[PDB]
Each structure stands twice: as structure tokens, then as C-alpha cells.
């Protein structure tokens, strides 16, 4: 609806940028088409379709309305063939906002090269979970989004950390509004597995090898979380939710201009959740606050500052899985799904807070530049106590391990980039040149020297977490890790012919880790980027890419001779076809991909079987591995009210000897979610469901009381979801979510420290949302 506008007659470029701004809309236009053109003047309360048409009066330009984006074009009488991937300047650097798009498919995205492109133009597997997806299925946190993400397998470490795989690999790359965090290990990484969705517009996942913007990082995927932004019109909501096992969620989200002119603007959100669980004596309080302010210094420079906060506060935390696989004499334990090996008082609370500033400037060039400053904190307070070992013993006793770790990581980021169009051989291309620096400092205390503790409980079968807390004694250890990343990067997208676009670039990287371990240094590392996209129809394009990444190894991954291994490196090879239907409203993709890892840390059994250097008691050995596989996906509008997101992925990852690895990631998986909105007398009703299936998965785990290895399998299984919403009122709606409808009982962890974990049993959630 109607928006306050005031854009005077200027260069068509500026006008278009000032429009997207004033209108909360992404505006895409071709540099060589708006050169030397004038916007006509607009002033007052206007409907955005009426406002853009006025603005373009005189320009000979056409508008394509596409949801939260408009593309502008300048039809010629000549027009002699069609450039679908023509170089196009964008007004929102991060992409198309997904909020209010009614869609499960995204618009534009800069996840791959910091160039704003569409899924179809991106020569890499890119899946997005959109704001409407999160809304409809109740995905209230990053674990929820991941479970619903095509390609992704979420498995458990314990009640407060999950693991995400793509393509053979745990994901350990996270970004916020396009800024990587340090996630070397779980000290730096507190809370990453727990981000509440209340403050995000979408989560965008780039799959393969993502060196080019992540820098040093894991193989497999990057998870990029995009924050909600302030708006030009006043709008907010309150949401209230109630579910299986005294799960109560509430949520406030307010957005608007804070001055008559609306040249300062703001958005605020808060959300609180207190929940018990199907797991006995586990409970979790979670708190999030987010505030962001936008100042327009003038028509082409905007200062933004903002801050976020999240506290994740549990009781009944476990260290590793929900119960021990084998008992004292080495039979397998049968236990209720409610069983929780955590102690009542045990807690792995994880907290995160960010303060950030950015500055963005439109050069007349058609170029835009942007500096991003960040102060981030990932903190933790972890007195963990939990039943551990081959228990029960024949008399039903068992033994608790208890250890305390507290600590904090402070991170500072500088990121600066320049992006813009340019002409080479009578045709238009774009460039990004950026440089980055991060310093992060992990500090901590460990307590493992317990003073006068009795770690035995006399009743395994009826365990309850009702065991005393120990005297933790004095600290055992103080941590001091310093990581310093420096990056410089460049990607050109050449529009070679009307059907061929060529990506050429890379990143140079300097990585230093300092402190209590010996110094880890990589200098002048080059991370190539080669990509092409070739158009075949108005509908389909093929693409190929070659992408890369490395991660200097952790300090403990040393060899025979006590030298650290060379960095864990991989290259992703990918060939593919993507399809685009209904003016971008529906996307499809089919891809073939191959990952070549070199220097993967491997144990080194012959040495470890009787070490010879007391300096490395547990040596590694750097080896090779290959992931081969393919993936299919679709997302968007099937028919007017009808939305899907579905994927199919196949993988086998082997190491050079031939043996299967990440065998707990299934070799085959499939996701489909969908909702439908009736038209007619039922137009206030939205219906929906979904299903996730995966094949066989296994672990090899060591039965230590019987001195043999065992194979633990999880037979293929489906999970089904259902969902419905009714818009009772222009302002008020009611929803219900049923998850795991057939109550399928399954495992999300087998073998992590010789333990296992169930997945959620059937669970409901009721909600009301109220929009002011
Ligand atoms: C260096 C640290 C800086 C921290 C910055 C934190 C920013 C927190 O501020 C929150 C601002 O939110 C603005 C919320 O928008 C509300 C707009 O509605 C106002 C009422 O409506 C007026 C008439 O329409
Ligand atoms: C072991 C768990 C088995 C439970 C299975 C139950 C499945 C039944 O689900 C159907 C629920 O329908 C109940 C209808 O309730 C209406 C929801 O309205 C929302 C409240 O409105 C808020 C008003 O402001």
C-alpha cells in the first residue's frame, strides 16, 4: 500500500536507487540503459506502482513487478536477441528481502560472490529458506531451519549442540549479514547451533567449497543469516505460542520511521521462550533482543548501527548424547525416549551478542561501496554433569563425569568492498573488490579437579538427574587463543556473449593463530574461483564451476614427528542445469558435484598403537577424500496459491583407500514442504504439510566390555509434518503445527562417545500472530 515519496529529477541511476530505498524494494537495472537518462519528479503519498511509473515518465523504460523486486528495462525497436544474464546493478546489496513475498523461493542473493545475482545466474548450488517458510512451519531457530533445509542432515552431539552436514562434511562456516564468524572449534562458536530466527529475514546456504567469501573455513556449505531491516512505513507484530511439553514462545517485532521525514528509521525485536522437553528433566529459557537504526546522511550515503543479543540457558544438559549405548557387561541398553543422562543442575548455557556499524555510499559511477564494523561476543557457562561410561552395572548403579568450562570470545571485524559495472569490448560487466580483517580472542577457565566428589548414582533405570553438584576446586587450565584472518578478494562477471557469463576471481588469505599452542601461520594463500553460466532457453541454463577452501588445522592434529598437518583443503567441481519459470516465481535445479579433499586429518593407528614421542601421544596423518554425488531441487509457485520447497540429494564420501566415511550422513535424502492457500469462501485458510525421508545410516562403535566393534544402523525412515493457519481478521491469525505426525521413533546420534540420542516425538504448537 501507499508510501511517502520525494525523489527529485536527477540521473536515472540515482533516482532508481533512492526509489528502492524509499520504497523498501529491490530495484534492478542495466547500467548501459539508464546512462544519460532523467527520472521525472515524484512527491507525496503514493502507491509504489503508481510512483515508479511517474518516475519513469520520459525515460522510455518498462517495469517488471516481481514481488519485493522490480526490474527496469528499456525496450528497443531493434532488439535482435536476448541477454538474460545482462549485467544489472542492484539497490539492495544483500539481495531481495523475503519478508511478505508469500514465497519459498528467493529473489536475488549475493551469497556466492558478493555480486547481487539470482539463483539462475549463480554458478553454485544455492538453497534458501525464506521468511514465509519459517513462518508457516514454525521454524523458530537455526536447528529448525536446518532440519527443513534440502541437502542438510542435522545430527546431535548433545542436548545443546547439533551438527550439520552437507556433501560429506560438518558445516562450520557461519555468517551474519555476509560477515564470517570465527568457528575454529566450539569455544569460538558458542551459540551458533542456537540462533533464534526472530531477527532474521532468511537463512541462505551455499553448498560446496566456499573459500571466496568465507576465507579459511570448512568444506561442504556456508550458512549465511540475513538480519531483518527497518522499513519506511510503520509495521509490527506480536506472536504468542504454546506447545508439547510446556513450550511457550512470545515475540515482538516493531518497525518504522522515527522522524517526520523518515531519514532516520528503526527496527526492534524481542523474543522469549521457556520450554521443557520430551527428555526428562531438561528445560531451556531463551532470550533475544535486536535493535537497528538507519541514518540517511544524505540521498546516497547511509549509516547503520545495530546490536543483537541472545541467551541460551538450559538445565539437564548432557555432555554427549542422551544415554550410553552399552551397559557394564556390554549388552545394548534399551531406554525410554524420555531418558536424560544429564544431571538436574547440568547446564551448557551459550550466549552471543553483536554490535555493528556500516556505511554505504552510492558513487555516481553507478558504483556502491560499503564498510562494515563488528564487535562480536560468543560466551559460555558450562557446568556439565552426566552419566557416562558402560553403565548400568549389574546392580543398577552408574557413574557421572562432571567438568566445568566457562569462557568468552571477543571478535572484531573490518570489511570493505567496492562493486560496480564496467565496459570492456562493447559489453557490460561488473567487479567486486574487497578487503577484510578479523581479530578474535578466546579466553577461558576449565575445572576438572573435583574435590571430594562421589560420582556414583544408585539407580540407572529411574535416573532423574538427582545427584549432588561437586566442589569444582580451583581452575585446571586457562585458555588463550588469538586468531587473526586477513583477506583480499576480487570477482569479475564478464558478459561474454548474450548467453555466456564468465566468473573469474579469488581471495588471498593470511591466517594466524597465536597463544598457548605453538604459532599457526599461513601466508599469501590463493583461493581460486572459476565459473560459467550458459543460457539455452528463456527457461534453462547450464553452469560449471571450480571453487576452493582451506582451514589451517587445529593444534592437536600433529604427525609422527610433531609437525602440524598442512591445512585441510578441498576443491568442489560442479556441472549443472537450472530452470526458471513464471518470471522468477518458481526455480528448479539439477547438479552433479565432486569434492576433492586433501590433507584430511587421520588418526595413524600403527604409531598411536604405542607412541614413540611423548610430545605427540596421538599422531595424525594427512590423507585424501572424494565426495561424489548429485542434487535436485525445486522451490516456489506450482500454481497460484501453491508453494513448495523440495530437494533430493545423493552422496558417497570415500577416502583414497576406498572406505566409506561420514556414514551417519545418509547416502540418500529427500525433503518436501508445501502449503496451499484456498481461494473463494476459504481464502482465509492456509493448509500445508511436509515430509522428510532418508536412507540407511550407520556408525562403527567399540563395545569395550566385550572387546569388539559393532555396526549400529538406523533403517531409512520418513518424518511427516502438517500445518494450517486461518486469517480470522485483517490483523489477527491462528495457526497449529503438528510435527512427526506418525510419531516415528528414530536416532539423531549413535556412537558419539559411545552414546545415542532420540529425535523429537510427535509434537504440537499452537500460535496467534497479531499485526499492527
Ligand atoms: C553503540 C551501541 C548502539 C546500540 C544501538 C541499538 C539501537 C536500539 O534502538 C531501537 C530503535 O527501534 C526503533 C523501533 O521503531 C519503532 C517506530 O515506531 C515509533 C512509534 O510510531 C510513531 C508514529 O508512527
Ligand atoms: C502424543 C501426542 C498426540 C497428540 C495428537 C493431536 C493432534 C490433533 O491436532 C488437532 C488440533 O485441533 C484443535 C483445534 O484448536 C484450534 C486452534 O486455535 C488456536 C487458538 O486461538 C488463539 C485465539 O487468539
UniProtKB/Swiss-Prot annotation:
It is found in: Cell outer membrane. GO terms for cellular component: cell outer membrane; membrane. Induction: By the siderophore, pyoverdine, and under iron starvation conditions. GO terms for biological process: pyoverdine biosynthetic process; siderophore-dependent iron import into cell. One of its GO terms (molecular function) is signaling receptor activity. Keywords: Cell outer membrane, Ion transport, Iron, Iron transport, Membrane, Receptor, Signal, TonB box, Transmembrane, Transmembrane beta strand, Transport. Its main location: membrane. InterPro entries: Plug_dom (IPR012910), Plug_dom_sf (IPR037066), Secretin/TonB_short_N (IPR011662), TonB-dep_rcpt-like (IPR039426), TonB-dep_rcpt_b-brl (IPR000531), TonB_rcpt_b-brl_sf (IPR036942), TonB_rcpt_CS (IPR010917), TonB_sidphr_rcpt (IPR010105). Gene3D superfamilies: 3.55.50.30, TonB-dependent receptor, beta-barrel domain, TonB-dependent receptor, plug domain. SMART domains: STN. It is a multi-pass membrane protein. Residues 233-772 form the TBDR beta-barrel domain. Residues 118-228 form the TBDR plug domain. Belongs to the TonB-dependent receptor family. This is Ferripyoverdine receptor. The lineage of its organism: Bacteria, Pseudomonadati, Pseudomonadota, Gammaproteobacteria, Pseudomonadales.
Amino acid at each position: 500500500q501507499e508510501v511517502e515519496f520525494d525523489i527529485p529529477p536527477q540521473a536515472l541511476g540515482s533516482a532508481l536507487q533512492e526509489f528502492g530505498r524509499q520504497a523498501d524494494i529491490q530495484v534492478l537495472y542495466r547500467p548501459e540503459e539508464v546512462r544519460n537518462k532523467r527520472s521525472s519528479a515524484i512527491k507525496g503519498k503514493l502507491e509504489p506502482n503508481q510512483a515508479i511509473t511517474e518516475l519513469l515518465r520520459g525515460t522510455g523504460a518498462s517495469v517488471d513487478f516481481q514481488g519485493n523486486a522490480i526490474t527496469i528495462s528499456v525496450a528497443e525497436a531493434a532488439d535482435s536477441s536476448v541477454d538474460l544474464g545482462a549485467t544489472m546493478i542492484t539497490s539492495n546489496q544483500l539481495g531481495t528481502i523475503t519478508e511478505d513475498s508469500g514465497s519459498y523461493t528467493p529473489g536475488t542473493i549475493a551469497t556466492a560472490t558478493r555480486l547481487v545475482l539470482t539463483p539462475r545466474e549463480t554458478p553454485q548450488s544455492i538453497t534458501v529458506v525464506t521468511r514465509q517458510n519459517m513462518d508457516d512451519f514454525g521454524l523458530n531457530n537455526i536447528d529448525d531451519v536446518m532440519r527443513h533445509t534440502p541437502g542438510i542432515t542435522v545430527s546431535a552431539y548433545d542436548t545443546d549442540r547439533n551438527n550439520y552436514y552437507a556433501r560429506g562434511f560438518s558445516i562450520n562456516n557461519f555468517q551474519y549479514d555476509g560477515i564470517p564468524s570465527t568457528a575454529r572449534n566450539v569455544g569460538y562458536s558458542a551459540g551458533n547451533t542456537l540462533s533464534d530466527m526472530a531477527i532474521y529475514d532468511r537463512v541462505e546456504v551455499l553448498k560446496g567449497a566456499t573459500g571466496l567469501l568465507t576465507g579459511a573455513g570448512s568444506l561442504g556449505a556456508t550458512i549465511n543469516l540475513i538480519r531483518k531491516k527497518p522499513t519506511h512505513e510503520f509495521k509490527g507484530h506480536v506472536e504468542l505460542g504454546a506447545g508439547s511439553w510446556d513450550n511457550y514462545r512470545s515475540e515482538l517485532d516493531v518497525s518504522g520511521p522515527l522522524t517526520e521525514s523518515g531519514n532516520v528509521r528503526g527496527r526492534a525485536v524481542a523474543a522469549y521462550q521457556d520450554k521443557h522437553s520430551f527428555m526428562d528433566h531438561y528445560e531451556r529459557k531463551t532470550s533475544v533482543y535486536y535493535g537497528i537504526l538507519e541514518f540517511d546522511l544524505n540521498p546516497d550515503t547511509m549509516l547503520t548501527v545495530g546490536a543483537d543479543y541472545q541467551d541460551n540457558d538450559p538445565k539437564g544438559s548432557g555432555w554427549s548424547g542422551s544415554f550410553p549405548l552399552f551397559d557394564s557387561q556390554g549388552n545394548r541398553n534399551d531406554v525410554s525416549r524420555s531418558f536424560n543422562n544429564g544431571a538436574k543442575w547440568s547446564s551448557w548455557e551459550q550466549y552471543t551478542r553483536t554490535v555493528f556499524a556500516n556505511l554505504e555510499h552510492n558513487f555516481a559511477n553507478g558504483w556502491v561501496g560499503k564498510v562494515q564494523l563488528d564487535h562480536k561476543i560468543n560466551g559460555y557457562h558450562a557446568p556439565l554433569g552426566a552419566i557416562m561410561g558402560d553403565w548400568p552395572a549389574p546392580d543398577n548403579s552408574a557413574k557421572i563425569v562432571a567438568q566445568k568450562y566457562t569462557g568468552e570470545t571477543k571478535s572484531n571485524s573490518l570489511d570493505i568492498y567496492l562493486t560496480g559495472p564496467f565496459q570492456f569490448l562493447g559489453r557490460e560487466h561488473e567487479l567486486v573488490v574487497g578487503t577484510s580483517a578479523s581479530f578474535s580472542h578466546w579466553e577461558g577457565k576449565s575445572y576438572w579437579n573435583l574435590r571430594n566428589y562421589d560420582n556414583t548414582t544408585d539407580d540407572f533405570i529411574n535416573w532423574d538427574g538427582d545427584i549432588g553438584k561437586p566442589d569444582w576446586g580451583t581452575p585446571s587450565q586457562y585458555i588463550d587463543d588469538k586468531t587473526r584472518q586477513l583477506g583480499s578478494y576480487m570477482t569479475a562477471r564478464f558478459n561474454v556473449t548474450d548467453d555466456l557469463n564468465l566468473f573469474l576471481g579469488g581471495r588471498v588469505v593470511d591466517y594466524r593463530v597465536t597463544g598457548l599452542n605453538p604459532t599457526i601461520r599461513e601466508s599469501g594463500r590463493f583461493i581460486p574461483y572459476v565459473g560459467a553460466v550458459y543460457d539455452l532457453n528463456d527457461t534453462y541454463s547450464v553452469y560449471a564451476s571450480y571453487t576452493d577452501i582451506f582451514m589451517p588445522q587445529d593444534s592437536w592434529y600433529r604427525d609422527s614427528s610433531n609437525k602440524l598437518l598442512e591445512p585441510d583443503e578441498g576443491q568442489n567441481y560442479e556441472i549443472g542445469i537450472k530452470g526458471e519459470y513464471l518470471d522468477g516465481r518458481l526455480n528448479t535445479s539439477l547438479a552433479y558435484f565432486e569434492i576433492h579433499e586433501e590433507n584430511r586429518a587421520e588418526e595413524d593407528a600403527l604409531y598411536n598403537s604405542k607412541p614413540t614421542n611423548p610430545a605427540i601421544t596421538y599422531a595424525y596423518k594427512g590423507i585424501k577424500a572424494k565426495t561424489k554425488g548429485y542434487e535436485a531441487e525445486i522451490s516456489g509457485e506450482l500454481a497460484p496459491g501453491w508453494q513448495v520447497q523440495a530437494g533430493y540429494t545423493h552422496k558417497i564420501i570415500r577416502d583414497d583407500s576406498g572406505k566409506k566415511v561420514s556414514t551417519w550422513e545418509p547416502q540418500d535424502q529427500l525433503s518436501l514442504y508445501t502449503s496451499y492457500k484456498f481461494k473463494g469462501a476459504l481464502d482465509k485458510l492456509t493448509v500445508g504439510g511436509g515430509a522428510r525421508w532418508q536412507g540407511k545410516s550407520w556408525q562403527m562403535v567399540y563395545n569395550n566390555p566385550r572387546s569388539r566393534w559393532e555396526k549400529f544402523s538406523q533403517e531409512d525412515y520418513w518424518l511427516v509434518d502438517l500445518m494450517a493457519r486461518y486469517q480470522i481478521t485483517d490483523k489477527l491469525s491462528a495457526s497449529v503445527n503438528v510435527n512427526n505426525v506418525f510419531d516415528k521413533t528414530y536416532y539423531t546420534n549413535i556412537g558419539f562417545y559411545t552414546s545415542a540420542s532420540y529425535g523429537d516425538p510427535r509434537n504440537l504448537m499452537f500460535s496467534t500472530r497479531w499485526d499492527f
